[PDB]
């Protein structure tokens, strides 16, 4: 791979060439994004985008000198994050000499949890919509890497309540679970097609507790949802789920 990229901070765009089309053509997929940990040694490491792209194998690649990349938060947010990657030399072959395609990647753009990202890229010079575009929702606190981030841990991402829930009567469910050192207040909820029962629990000890939920419908096979009320997450803490079972479970 002879040509390389030196990437820099030029703005030079407009959050309008990214929304040139309301619908972006669905086959502009030469552009991929994946999240990568900035530091391996760290659990609460910052998360960056690894934006990689492949170049078209055709004669116009000889006219290519820069690729522009803009990332947009889309949440009634605007762009203002563009980078311009200049290619250091001209492209002599339409592919690498032992390379599926010409491939480049840029790592940057710090990522927030549970965030929708539109990323568009355009080759310089050359149509005048995005040459490549991808939609991207960053992972949340349930992802295997993001769960160790501080905001996720403090919201209960690593809480293992080990819910056991049993259909006791025609209208009651017994829910057992192990409390967390992160909080003392919990709400147990039983849900089939709608919420059929709720119970609140106050327990200050780290213990395996038990609570009866009175239900209004069929509970066998319904979901149990445990909401903890840990600090920093208010009413938006990570919920834990289980399923209601017939007890006794043996013959």
């Amino acid at each position, epitope marked *: 791979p002879e040509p390389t990229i030196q990437c820099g901070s030029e703005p030079g765009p407009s959050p309008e060439w990214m929304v040139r089309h309301t*619908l972006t*053509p669905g086959d502009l997929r030469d552009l991929r994004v994946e999240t990568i940990k900035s530091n391996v040694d760290l659990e609460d490491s910052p998360i960056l985008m690894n934006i990689s792209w492949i170049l078209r194998a055709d004669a116009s690649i000889r006219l290519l000198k820069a690729t522009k990349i803009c990332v947009m938060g889309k949440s009634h947010f605007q762009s203002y994050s563009c980078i311009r990657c200049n290619y250091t030399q001209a492209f002599q072959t339409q592919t690498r000499p032992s390379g599926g395609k010409w491939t480049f990647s840029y790592v940057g753009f710090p990522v927030e949890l549970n965030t929708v990202y539109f990323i568009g890229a355009h080759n310089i010079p050359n149509e005048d919509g995005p040459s490549m575009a991808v939609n991207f929702t960053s992972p949340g606190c349930l992802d295997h890497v993001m769960k160790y981030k501080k905001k996720c841990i403090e919201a209960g991402s690593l809480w293992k309540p080990n819910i056991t829930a049993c259909k006791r009567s025609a209208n009651t469910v017994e829910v057992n679970f192990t409390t967390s050192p992160l909080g003392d207040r919990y709400m147990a909820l039983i849900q089939s097609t709608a919420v059929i029962g709720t119970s609140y629990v106050s327990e200050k000890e780290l213990t395996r507790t038990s609570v009866v939920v009175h239900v209004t419908g069929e509970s066998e096979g319904a979901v149990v949802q445990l909401t903890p009320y840990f600090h920093t997450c208010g009413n938006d803490c990570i919920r834990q789920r289980g399923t209601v079972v017939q007890c006794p479970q043996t013959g």
Partner: antibody
Amino acid sequence: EVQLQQSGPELVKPGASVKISCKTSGYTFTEYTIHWVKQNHGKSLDWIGGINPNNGGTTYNQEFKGKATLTVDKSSSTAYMEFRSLTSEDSAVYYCARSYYGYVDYWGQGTTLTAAA
Amino acid sequence: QIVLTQSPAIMSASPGEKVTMTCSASSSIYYIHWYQQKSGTSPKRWIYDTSKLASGVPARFSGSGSGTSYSLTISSMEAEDAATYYCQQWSSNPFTFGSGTKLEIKR
């Protein structure tokens, strides 16, 4: 399983307006673009436009622009296509279809629109 | 802006013979997709992303191509294969189809 259920055939006065519907089920409605496609008696397929049901954003084939309007109703998981003034040139079967990337993986069954005096 | 030209418009193939139909794009596209339509029903996704077969599509079918040139191939014609095949692109707006190859069975 994914299903796109389209409304039934329509007889429409020439010059009058008509609105046909596309009822989706079996998937998260707001996650997939809905396209509309015309097929005339010559059997060629014409894309009319698509709509993002998440935000209602649309893109139209400019060969049809101003004649058709696409809307969704998220609560019922339904897409709509409205022709403001159907003419004899507009009599055809109309499909809705769901897209993933650049292709459509599910099609409605089609709705015949006939301009008849 | 891109348009798709399909050839041949109509063809008939002997049972057992190899069938090829082509799709030519007015400028380069990232993928082509193919739909099958039999008279009186909706088109069905047949080959997508240029060379992947939808579930249930016979492995006698294959697609290939790149740039502006693509084709759909049947290794050995079967009577069930007779239908109209449309190619399709959405590398540029508007989303467009080719005009179709109507494939009939010789007897």
